[PDB]
Amino acid sequence: MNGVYDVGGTDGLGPINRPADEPVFRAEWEKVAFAMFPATFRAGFMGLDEFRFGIEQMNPAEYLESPYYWHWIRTYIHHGVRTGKIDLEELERRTQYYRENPDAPLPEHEQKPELIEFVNQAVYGGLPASREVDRPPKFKEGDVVRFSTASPKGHARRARYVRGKTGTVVKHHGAYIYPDTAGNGLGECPEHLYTVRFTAQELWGPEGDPNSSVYYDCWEPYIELVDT
Amino acid sequence: MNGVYDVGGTDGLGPINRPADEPVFRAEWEKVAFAMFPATFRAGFMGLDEFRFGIEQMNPAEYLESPYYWHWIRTYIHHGVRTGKIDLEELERRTQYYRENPDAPLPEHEQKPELIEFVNQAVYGGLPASREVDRPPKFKEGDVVRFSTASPKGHARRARYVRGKTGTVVKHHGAYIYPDTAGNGLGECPEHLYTVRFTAQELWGPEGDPNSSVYYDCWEPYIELVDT
Amino acid sequence: TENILRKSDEEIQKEITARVKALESMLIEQGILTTSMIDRMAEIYENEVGPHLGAKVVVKAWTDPEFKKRLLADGTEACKELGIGGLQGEDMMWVENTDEVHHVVVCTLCSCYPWPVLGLPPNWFKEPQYRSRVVREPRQLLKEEFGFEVPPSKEIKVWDSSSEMRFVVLPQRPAGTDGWSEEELATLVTRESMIGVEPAKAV
Amino acid sequence: TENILRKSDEEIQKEITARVKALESMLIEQGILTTSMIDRMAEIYENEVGPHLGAKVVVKAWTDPEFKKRLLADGTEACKELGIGGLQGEDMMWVENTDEVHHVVVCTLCSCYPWPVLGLPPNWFKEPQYRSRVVREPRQLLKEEFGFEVPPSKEIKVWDSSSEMRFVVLPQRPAGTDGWSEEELATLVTRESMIGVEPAKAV
Ligand SMILES: [Co+2]
Ligand SMILES: [Co+2]
């Protein structure tokens, strides 16, 4: 989607806010937000691509100025409601309950060794998105390609700043989960992945740095051949 | 500039909020904001193009959700500070004064017939931006042109959605004040103006309406010839 | 749309009111703004300049083929025949709706609107929702927001006012109005019909 | 940046805290989230996984030409030699800074970062300011924000992580470090030097 979240190249966002140092988690709620990532993933709320799409659908004004982990909370709620796992009305009632009683206890529950097992496995083993496909790569290093001008209303990894631009294939990485299908609940449908080099002049015109290039990853359907 | 204000084509902004009816001015402050337009213009705070640029430089989150006329206030303050006509510290002090004393009187002042004269002249006579230039038009109806991919950091009327796109010249309107110079305090520097037609498929790819076209006005430097 | 970071409308209005009164006090002291100048501008756009002016132009075009030709050839000059023109309407280009084409106007970059014939634009026209979507999904927007269904085979031309040229839609004359007076026809011309988000009133 | 519509940081934190505790209570009742699972995830990224891991990889590459070749050929496999890898670092591609080229990484679309070697990203990396500007004005950003001046003649390659491939910068080894031990060299490798916003520590 052509969401505001796709900020690459956007002007007027202001100076970078960067403290000399900071903690990993600025508040207890952040630790909870973070931990809900593997929790909702394991529960089937969504995959990684869908996770991103939920955030992309946020109110732009809220997205631009809210604490980072709040974006994660928004996507959990989005998918919880989508899958019917979260009842919004009950969530609203509980929110008010905790507003009025911030120190009220959390529900009684049993600890589950399987959840710790999942955490250790996901953290140290990873959640690889690489997949094998039957078709060979359509492109190769050195190929001059043009990025698609398609503008899907659903999830995609097509930054507005690279659309319709011409670049050179830097490397073929093999096949991976395809965002355009995965992020929209349409399955993995793996596609070959390539890193493509775009000159700053190609991306920004005369205002671009005369000695800079941006490397952007493109799934096979995103690009078409110009010069082999 | 590549500001968020350039919303044409942006997804996720939400449903249109449209009451069955509404007053021209929803509050007294809106009438004041509106009237400050000809007041600051006459005072030399800025021209029309600079007026727009001041709004484009607003905090995006504030821009997207603030009442319309607040945008006007922001541009008045922006240019008042730029020209040195408005002292920010004094403005802040007065703001707090009126926060604490909302019914406090406005400064004593004499009415000026010249200001009413200006209002009547601007309203009924207009502030025409059409200008005469020595050079003849470079393009004509029927010409197939391509919109520039330049990305000026200052003011311009180059919507991101039309950049690099190919269209057909619909009409030559004569020469007008050029935004790229005017909005950046560089003078009128008039350029010929053209309405260009872009198909929805050209702008949005396969997601575009198969039977729609967008007409966008382009100053001469914005477009280059493809096919005469 | 919900934004957990946003203050209440009440608090927002209180803050804006104070900031505006503060800025106003300074411009007043500078001698560039007065209470009479404020009242005059407001009076003009609250009671003098409005969509009834554009309606007069539309009905004249509907009942005078020659004027219609002049209107489509040079909107500014044609409107001057009726004493209509001025601020933010110095350059007007009228576009004719037909059985094959439907026009709709927008200012994706801000809020540009033909003040001399329509007065100040309604808030929705100036907001991000309409502006962002109309150039991308005009057919769906017209149906969903305005209950106006434009057949897939009928072309929708969206006019984005990126320059000082102001686009105005000349809606088609509704059926069953043969021989109606200009005054009677005017009751069918709405601000929405001249923006292109709705056709002129039926019946 | 100032936004007159925005609530105070205090009110924002109070609201978020309540909403998170509410959502947490529901996920707990569903049996998919527990207090031990929360504490375990936090413990890992607060004390176990951090930039000290990436530093180990950097110093090994600096002192072992063969490992460096393997690192640049296949980042994931090379890092596995040191028992480094996992979540959000399943696919790593390391890029070498030289006298002719400087690399800098970003995730313009969100916040993608190589967790296995750098831990969780600092907030500025995840924010709109850095993300929007680095692909457009990398040279000016490095100078203005990080006090890092990259000569106009030196190419700046910006790597945007649009896929699961995670880019990591192998900074140049600072001068005057001949014969230093891997432990001593590690003191010069910062999280910033592996993002590309700063070179490794001088001296
Ligand atoms: Co406008
Ligand atoms: Co990211």
- Chain A residues touching D24 at Cβ < 8 A: 32, 36, 106
CB contact under 8 A, C5 and D19: no
State how far the Cα of C80 lies from the Cα of A112, in Å rounded to an integer. Answer: 80
CB contact under 8 A, A12 and B56: yes
**Side chain identity at residue C136, one-letter code:** R
Return the ∠ at Cα B202 (arms to B166 and B221), rounded to 5°. Answer: 25
Return the ∠ at Cα B213 (arms to B211 and B216), rounded to 5°. Answer: 175
Kindly report the nearest CA distance between residue C100 and chain B, in angstroms.
11
H runs (alpha helix) in A4-58: 28-42, 48-56
Residue C102 CB contacts under 8 Å (≥ 6 apart), including other chains: C150, C154, C155, C156, C157, C196
Beta bridge partners, D106, equal: D160
What is the set of domains in chain C, with CATH numbers? Answer: 1-203 (3.90.330.10)
Ligand nearest to the CA of B72: 1
Element (H, E) at A131: strand A130-131
CA distances to B20, C78, C130 from C144, in Å: 15, 35, 12
Structure tokens at B37: 């337009």
End-to-end CA distance of chain D: 37
Catalytic one of C8, C36, C107, C161: C107
| CB A197 within 8 Å of CB A171 | no
State how far the Cα of A37 lies from the Cα of A48, in Å rounded to an integer. Answer: 9
State how far the Cα of D178 lies from the Cα of A128, in Å rounded to an integer. Answer: 39
User: Could you confirm whether C107 is annotated as catalytic?
Assistant: yes
Interface with C, mutate which of D3, D5, D16 (most C CBs under 10 A): D5
Q: Residue B19: name the closest of C123, C63, D116 by CA.
A: C123
User: Could you confirm whether C79 is annotated as catalytic?
Assistant: no
| CB B10 within 8 Å of CB A4 | yes
**Interruption sites in chain C after residues (C→N beyond 2.5 Å):** none
| CB C109 within 8 Å of CB C162 | yes
- Residue B106, judged by CB atoms within 10 A of its CB (0-12, 13-18, 19+), counts as middle
Residue B35 CB contacts under 8 Å (≥ 6 apart), including other chains: C33, C37, C38, C40, C41, C42
State how far the Cα of B51 lies from the Cα of D60, in Å rounded to an integer. Answer: 57
Concatenated DSSP letters of chain C: ---TTBPPHHHHHHHHHHHHHHHHHHHHHTTS--HHHHHHHHHIIIIISSHHHHHHHHHHHHH-HHHHHHHHH-HHHHHHTTT---TT-SEEEEEE--SSEEEEEE-TTS----HHHH-SPPHHHHSHHHHHHHTTSHHHHHHHHH-----TTSEEEEEE--SSEEEEEEPPPPSS-TT--HHHHHTT--HHHHHTSSPSPP-
CB contact under 8 A, B4 and A9: no
| CB D151 within 8 Å of CB D25 | no
| CB A24 within 8 Å of CB D45 | yes
How many CB atoms sit inside 10 A of residue D201's CB?
15
Residue C31 CB contacts under 8 Å (≥ 6 apart), including other chains: B109, B112
Q: Residue C56: name the closest of C157, C163, C181 by CA.
A: C181
Place of tokens 């209950």: C147
The one-character DSSP state at A84 is T
- Residue B49, judged by CB atoms within 10 A of its CB (0-12, 13-18, 19+), counts as buried
CA distances to A18, C4, C120 from D12, in Å: 20, 7, 36
- Where would I find the beta strands (DSSP E) of B50-190? 130-131, 144-147, 166-176
- Where would I find the beta strands (DSSP E) of chain B? 130-131, 144-147, 166-176, 191-199, 212-219, 223-227
End-to-end CA distance of chain C: 37
Q: Residue A209: name the closest of A199, A219, A217 by CA.
A: A199
CB environment A20-40: b (16+ within 10 A), e (fewer)? eeeebbeeebbbbbbbbbbbb
Q: Using DSSP, state whether B80 is helix, strand or coil.
A: helix
**Side chain identity at residue D163, one-letter code:** S
C108–A contact, CB cutoff 8 A = no
Place of tokens 């799409």: A53
Could you say which residues from 130 to 189 on chain C have a Cβ atom under 8 Å away from some Cβ of chain B?
130-133, 135-139, 141, 145, 152-165, 167
Q: Residue D172: name the closest of D196, D152, D148 by CA.
A: D196
**Side chain identity at residue A75, one-letter code:** T
Pick the CATH number of B130-228 from 2.30.30.50, 2.60.40.10, 1.10.1510.10, 2.30.42.10: 2.30.30.50
Residue C152 CB contacts under 8 Å (≥ 6 apart), including other chains: B210, B211, C139
Instruction: Give me the active site residues of D, please.
Output: 107, 110-112
Among B34, B173, B216, beta carbon nearest to C162? B216
Residue D146 CB contacts under 8 Å (≥ 6 apart), including other chains: D192, D197, D198
Structure tokens at C46: 């609250």
Domain boundaries of chain B, sorted by first residue: 1-126, 130-228
- Chain D residue whose CA is closest to B62: D3
State how far the Cα of A107 lies from the Cα of A110, in Å rounded to an integer. Answer: 10
CA atoms within 13 A on the CB side of C24: 27
Resolution in A: 1.8
The backbone torsions φ and ψ at residue B110, rounded to the nearest 5 degrees and listed phi first, read: -95, 145
The backbone torsions φ and ψ at residue B167, rounded to the nearest 5 degrees and listed phi first, read: -145, -175
Q: Cα of B211 to ligand 2 centre, how many Å?
A: 36
Return the ∠ at Cα B54 (arms to B51 and B59), rounded to 5°. Answer: 145
Beta bridge partners, C160, equal: B216, C106
State how far the Cα of C96 lies from the Cα of D137, in Å rounded to an integer. Answer: 45
Domain B1-126 grouped into CATH 1.10.472.20: yes
| CB D46 within 8 Å of CB A24 | yes
State how far the Cα of D5 lies from the Cα of D24, in Å rounded to an integer. Answer: 29
CB contact under 8 A, B111 and C86: no
Structural method: X-ray
